[PDB]
Design an enzyme around this catalytic site. Structure first.
Site, mmCIF file in Angstrom:
data_model
loop_
_atom_site.group_PDB
_atom_site.id
_atom_site.type_symbol
_atom_site.label_atom_id
_atom_site.label_comp_id
_atom_site.label_asym_id
_atom_site.label_seq_id
_atom_site.Cartn_x
_atom_site.Cartn_y
_atom_site.Cartn_z
ATOM 1 N N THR A 102 0.736 -1.221 -0.119
ATOM 2 C CA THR A 102 -0.179 0.054 -0.060
ATOM 3 C C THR A 102 0.884 1.180 0.064
ATOM 4 O OG1 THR A 102 -0.120 0.013 2.388
ATOM 5 C CG2 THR A 102 -1.791 -1.171 1.356
ATOM 6 N N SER A 103 0.339 2.485 -0.603
ATOM 7 C CA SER A 103 0.712 3.634 -0.430
ATOM 8 C C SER A 103 0.876 4.144 0.898
ATOM 9 C CB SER A 103 0.141 4.678 -1.355
ATOM 10 O OG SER A 103 -1.126 4.762 -0.809
ATOM 11 N N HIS A 126 7.885 0.267 3.946
ATOM 12 C CA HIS A 126 7.269 -0.767 4.608
ATOM 13 C C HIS A 126 8.716 -1.627 4.959
ATOM 14 C CE1 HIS A 126 3.062 -0.421 3.344
ATOM 15 N NE2 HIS A 126 3.433 -0.087 2.260
ATOM 16 N N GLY A 127 8.345 -2.676 5.981
ATOM 17 C CA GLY A 127 9.531 -3.267 6.254
ATOM 18 C C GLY A 127 9.035 -4.612 7.294
ATOM 19 N N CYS A 149 8.068 -1.191 9.656
ATOM 20 C CA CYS A 149 7.697 -2.393 10.468
ATOM 21 C C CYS A 149 8.845 -3.407 10.763
ATOM 22 C CB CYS A 149 6.465 -3.027 10.062
ATOM 23 S SG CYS A 149 4.854 -2.110 10.178
#
Lengths: 4, 92, 146, 92, 146, 4
Positions: C34-35, C93-94, C135
């Site tokens: 997701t953005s 993101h992660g 994350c």
């Protein structure tokens, strides 16, 4: 609030 | 000689294994807090102490709101990982 | 001269150093990611904050995993002799030990290895700071009423 | 509320993924250094600063000796992981 | 009263707190783990060091994975109300995220969970320190000449 | 020196  | 892994500092937004929270309008809890503490204490405190203030700010002032019960009312604690060998002040 | 303790890093070099900000907001459709709404607020806040600390801020937006690695490699190959430190901020993101490029994941270890004491000699003995907003898994902290 | 993971401090003897060194006669590099710094600075410095001194001591004063080339002349850097929300002094 | 900042943990409680030292030197033959020569030197140094900081030091030697978990559970169930903090030192073989009992591994997360802010209320808001002398993998740092 |  959202999560990464 | 010194360790090749020495002098690294990893300022993680959250604890190992946890999600990290981001508000679509205000930005991430961690970055919001980090910038606020650097602006207020970068010319006064040692970096680890600044990051500790960031930990307290994120830990106390933020709590998630979600229509999904699974993600509602959750908390977050940043994670400071230091392999630094000296104190770090942004000023001199 | 008088007693010298060396308890704090030398931060009076001509330059404070670089502050590389990787701001990934839009991801390739194929990744299913997701953005990251609101990340531009973070990027701007960081840019101004480190600008005031006198860092040479460079903002990079929506980089693929390849571009992230290329950027880090190139940066680690610069002459940091006149720089007091190095700062890299990752917004994406992660998962544990991983940061996402717009087209896929990148091991954090791969990024940081470029700056090892033996691989980036102009930064040896100088603080290398990595600030990571991403994350590290899927656990949620229920908290406790104080 | 506060995060359930808040107020924890993990003083690791070595960086993530690395071996940790121990001398059969003098004890481990990390514990030797940690006790030395606590004895010398516990009544003077904040805990994170004490641990930073420990990082520098381990990083600079120790290097392995081994008849096995694979394990010879190696180094070590401890790893401070903080989820603390305040400064910590052992004295008051 | 005057301005109160609360920037440092309250460390003037009647007791500084407990310092649990788990010193595993001899391991069961079946585990294939070697004896950790020199760990007694570490254990004694820690005992004296924390004794001087006024901690109630408790040394435990050669505990099985079961005994480690039992000890931690029991300790977390004590009333720490009059204690300023908690300290646990682990001396043993290990791997990333794991510490070895004399008969097998124990996840560090399992040990620390007993002290979560919601599971040990008498330590909520107080510093919980875990000092770990153990391997976190098999990588070796070649170092760099300065 | 030995490893843990």
């Amino acid at each position: 609030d959202e999560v990464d | 000689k010194i360790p090749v892994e020495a002098d690294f500092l990893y300022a993680y937004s959250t604890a190992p294994g946890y999600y990290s929270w981001r508000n679509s309008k205000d930005g991430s809890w961690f970055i919001q807090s980090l910038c606020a503490m650097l602006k207020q204490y970068a010319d006064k405190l040692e970096f680890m102490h600044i990051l500790t203030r960031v930990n307290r700010k994120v830990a106390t002032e933020f709590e998630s709101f979600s229509f999904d019960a699974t993600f509602h009312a959750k908390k977050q604690i940043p994670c400071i990982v230091s392999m630094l060998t000296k104190e770090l002040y942004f000023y001199h | 001269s008088g007693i010298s303790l060396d308890n704090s890093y030398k931060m009076d070099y001509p330059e404070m150093g670089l502050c590389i900000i990787i701001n990934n907001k839009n991801f390739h459709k194929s990744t299913g990611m997701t953005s990251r709404s609101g990340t531009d607020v973070d990027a701007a806040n960081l840019r101004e904050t480190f600008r005031n600390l006198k860092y040479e801020v460079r903002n990079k937006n929506d980089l693929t995993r390849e571009e992230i690695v290329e950027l880090m490699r190139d940066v680690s190959k610069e002459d940091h002799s006149k720089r007091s430190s190095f700062v890299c901020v990752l917004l994406s993101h992660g998962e544990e030990g991983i940061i996402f490029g717009t087209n896929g994941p990148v091991d954090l270890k791969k990024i940081t290895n470029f700056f090892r004491g033996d691989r980036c000699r102009s930064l040896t003995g100088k603080p290398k700071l990595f600030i990571i907003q991403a994350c590290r898994g899927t656990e949620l902290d229920c908290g406790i009423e104080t």
